[PDB]
Amino acid sequence: YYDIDPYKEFGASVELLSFLPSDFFPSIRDLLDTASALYREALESPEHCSPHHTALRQAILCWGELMNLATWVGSNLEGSRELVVSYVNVNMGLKIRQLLWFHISCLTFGRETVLEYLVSFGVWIRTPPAYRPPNAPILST
Amino acid sequence: YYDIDPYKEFGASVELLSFLPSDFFPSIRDLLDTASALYREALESPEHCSPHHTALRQAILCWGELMNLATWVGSNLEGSRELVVSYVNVNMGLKIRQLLWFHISCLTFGRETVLEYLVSFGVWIRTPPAYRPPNAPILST
Amino acid sequence: YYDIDPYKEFGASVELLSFLPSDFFPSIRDLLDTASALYREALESPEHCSPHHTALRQAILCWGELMNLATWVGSNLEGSRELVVSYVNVNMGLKIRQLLWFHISCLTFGRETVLEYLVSFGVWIRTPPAYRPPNAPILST
Amino acid sequence: YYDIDPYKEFGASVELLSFLPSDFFPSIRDLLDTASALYREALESPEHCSPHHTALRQAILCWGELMNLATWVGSNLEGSRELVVSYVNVNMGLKIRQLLWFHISCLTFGRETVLEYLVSFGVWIRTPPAYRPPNAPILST
Amino acid sequence: YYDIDPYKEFGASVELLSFLPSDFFPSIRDLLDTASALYREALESPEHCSPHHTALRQAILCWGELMNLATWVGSNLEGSRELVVSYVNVNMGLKIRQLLWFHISCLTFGRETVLEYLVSFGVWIRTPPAYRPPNAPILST
Amino acid sequence: YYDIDPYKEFGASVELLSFLPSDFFPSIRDLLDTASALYREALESPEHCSPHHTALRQAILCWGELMNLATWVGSNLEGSRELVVSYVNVNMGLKIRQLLWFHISCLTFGRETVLEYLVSFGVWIRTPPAYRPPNAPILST
């Protein structure tokens, strides 16, 4: 097929978010726990809200799809058990984490507030370490 | 946290869509060509619209990633090539078809109208063949 | 005191429903799945509504009690298992089907509309096959 | 299937009424005679009234169903005559009596009046006999 | 400079008309007789009208010139007579048919109406034959 | 038979307090000591409304009965002395700690203030150590 960028509607791009390093994003288990903690009720009583909830729902569904596929592959055929599990998360399991991180953070700290955090992280990481402050510009309210 | 239904915000459950038989849904290629045909420009110039476009975007992404994974499996290790592809479509590829079928049909023929087609198909299939109307369930403007 | 017809309050007699053939009515399983599908929540949060919900409730109870009785007969004494079950559905199980068929169809397609379907089916079946419209009695919104 | 409680709409529960002992309810013949005595006319000229009449109609119909079944069982096959008759009434013939007792009493003495009688019976039966009055709190206008 | 689509000014693309199969379009003779039948006078007394008449005029000219060229090829040099004529209709003669089919149908049944017929035919052809409505796509006033 | 949580009446769930690590909560003795220090006059003397006081009283009484049961068991029958007490604190002693911690913190800093502390601590632990604020969040005025 051809390209498509989910973040265009929200006000970013897939490569604007590419500045952040791979190891920066939290573990997927923690992201799911945070999503279930203070947003379990909102996802079960859907009124006309932001598409963030919908995106979270499809992300969770396409990820449970991956869990079912991995369990199947481990259960019938044939690195028979772990190679596919170790392969799915490295290349593409990062994609789900990026979606969850953006949508969860946008809901709590607000829509616009995340954007200046992103550009501030971009200038921080581009400058050589000899001239940048040793602490990253962590976000808050 | 694996009991989430997507369609509830739109007005339908998962068992409501279980009236339709499995093989009724069209092929993935035809749906993709249709979406690229009369809805390509909408996905590239996104304004504040219904979550249908977002659902289509994540569906296309969650399909393409599976395509790449199938290519990797067929070209890297080990039924090395044909077993995995024959399983994805029958097991999980059906889910992608249901999303595209619902969202595309809801966009063109409307949100309200596509609901009566579901119940009308339900009564059509349950009646015995001896009094079944001969081959006339269909959707039109 | 055994001459009581239920449907008179709704607008129909028992012989009026005798136009339809015996085998036209759908199976009990399909009716139960339909009722659980698009009417489960109504039976659990009862406000002042039409007696249709009450009729459905006593119909479901009068069916489940027969199920328990059949289980008892098949598992306790003595055609010990299959004779009694083969008789309940053909003799009295038909009555439960007629109640569910009328009330469910009356709820969705309306009270007034379901009456013309009865007379329309009556004229369709009485005409000779030589001029009968080929296989097109059906109900829709 | 699953549970359902007919009395929720009326304002009680199946287990609220479970406080009353099994031998408290009148004989079914007397209940039918009382129903036919001062309510034969109301059941043959149905205007938009309380669902009590409908519930009585379906109860009478599902009970005549049982009479027909018992006569059949006694007439063709095979405790061949009385075991089924003695079994239907003990476990489930009580259910019809509970329906008839509630609906008949609610019509005569009023809707709300039956409720305080029920709770007053509950406190009376729970207290040990050493401290409760020897006479039960019988109901009236 | 060879990427130009004609139908965009009217409201349709080229791939939108690719839903229809190749052999669905009528013959050239029937279209010519129809145009001469109910539209001869319009092409001879031209006022300020829609570009449909102009499109028809250049289509007829671009067909007649090919007819003259085929006559020349068959009567001058060299499959001297039948090879070239058998190729023009199958290769490029189809394009003339598409123009006449669209413009003639748009003139009689209207500009807006002929668009829904395109999407309606699209959904009709993509569905599997097992649930396809039996042979009923058609256009009428 | 009965499954109910004691937190929904205030504005928090039971899973919300489960997101924090178990070892975060202080020891059982310190919580009782501070409760006696700050609310001995409040617990003994009745005050209007203030459900926190009633919940605290109930928790203290239940803890006392549990301790009395432990003393009775440890010196009567049979790990006769240490197995059960080492099992009490781990199994339901943790819940007692959560009850005391929530209400005492709610009484001092207010009901609304303790809520953002829960989520702020929740996200802080989930974020990677290299990018989180160097100091842990603490509860204060």
Author numbering:
A (entry chain B), B (entry chain A), C (entry chain A), D (entry chain B), E (entry chain A), F (entry chain C): 49 to 126, 278 to 340
Published text:
The N-terminal domain of HBcAg (aa 1–149) can form a dimer and be assembled into a capsid with an icosahedral symmetry composed of 180 (T = 3 state) or 240 (T = 4 state) subunits. HAF is composed of HBcAg, along with histidine and tyrosine tags for binding to gold ions, as well as a tandem repeat of the affibody for binding to EGFR. In the HAF sequence, the affibody was inserted between α4 and α5 of the HBcAg, the spike tip of the HBcAg. The affibody used in this study specifically binds to the extracellular domain of EGFR with a dissociation constant (KD) of 5.4 nM.
HAF was expressed in E. coli and self-assembled into a spherical capsid form. A Fourier shell correlation (FSC) of 0.143 was chosen as the cutoff for resolution determination, and the final resolutions of HAF (T = 4 state) and HAF (T = 3 state) were 3.86 Å and 3.60 Å, respectively. The three subunits forming the asymmetric unit of HAF (T = 3 state) are colored in red, blue, and green. The density map of the affibody was not clearly visible since the connected linkers induced flexibility of the affibody, causing the structures of HAF to appear very similar to those of the HBcAg. Each linker composed of 10 or more residues made the affibody flexible, and thus the structure of the affibody in HAF could not be clearly confirmed even though the molecular structure of HAF was obtained. As a result, it was confirmed that HAF, in which the affibody was inserted by manipulating the spike tip, has a similar overall structure to that of HBcAg. The overall structure of HAF was not significantly different from that of HBcAg, except in having the affibody on the spike.
